[PDB]
RNA sequence: UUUUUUUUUUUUUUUUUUUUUUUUUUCUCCUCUUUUUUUUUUUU
């Protein structure tokens, strides 16, 4: 995300401007990330706090390079 | 009518000890051919 510029956020091949998967938390790894984050969002938009951190910049970039490799 | 004598199975028992798997060679060695390397996408 905000580790890069807007121009690097698009999904030109499909004419979208943002595209990921969320339909497979089981056979992949970015999807469990997306699960944790979406559920953190539905649980945080109540004005409380989600104890226990989620990620950090370097962690996310090493995970995404690992997933590209795999 | 034929008496008397010529030994036998070596003696001994009431001595201390503080190590340790194995064990000892063999040299340098020409990998052949459409490629940059493909890549989104969706159904597990």
| Gyration radius, in Å | 14 Å
Fraction of residues in helices? 40-55%
> Oligomerization state of this entry?
part of a larger assembly
Roughly how many Å apart are the termini? 21 Å
Helix-strand pattern, N to C? HH
Major sheet characteristics: none
Class from helix and strand fractions: mainly alpha
Beta-strand content bin: under 5%
Using DSSP, what is the number of strands?
Answer: 0
- Categorize the overall geometry: globular
Q: Count up the helices.
A: 2
PDB class: ribosome
Keywords: RNA-binding, RNA-degradation, cytoplasm, helicase, ribosome
Entry title: 40S-bound human SKI2-exosome complex
Name: DIS3-like exonuclease 1
Description of the molecule:
With 70 residues, the protein is an all-alpha fold. The chain has two helices and no strands. The longest helix is centred in the middle third of the chain and has 15 residues, at 30-44. It binds one RNA strand of 44 nucleotides through residues 11-14, 24, 26-27.
Secondary structure blueprint with pairings:
Layout: H1 30-44, H2 57-69
This protein binds one RNA strand of 44 nucleotides through loops.
Family: Belongs to the RNR ribonuclease family.
Subcellular location: Cytoplasm
Subunit structure: Component of the RNA exosome complex. The catalytically inactive RNA exosome core (Exo-9) complex is believed to associate with catalytic subunits EXOSC10, and DIS3 or DIS3L in cytoplasmic- and nuclear-specific RNA exosome complex forms.
């Amino acid at each position: 995300t905000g580790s890069c510029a807007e121009e690097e956020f698009h999904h030109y091949g499909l004419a979208l401007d943002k595209y990921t998967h969320f339909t497979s938390p089981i056979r992949r790894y970015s999807d469990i990330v997306v699960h944790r984050l979406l559920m953190a969002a539905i649980s945080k938009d109540k004005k409380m706090e989600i104890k226990g951190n989620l990620f950090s910049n370097k962690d996310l970039e090493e995970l995404c390079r690992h997933i590209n490799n795999r």
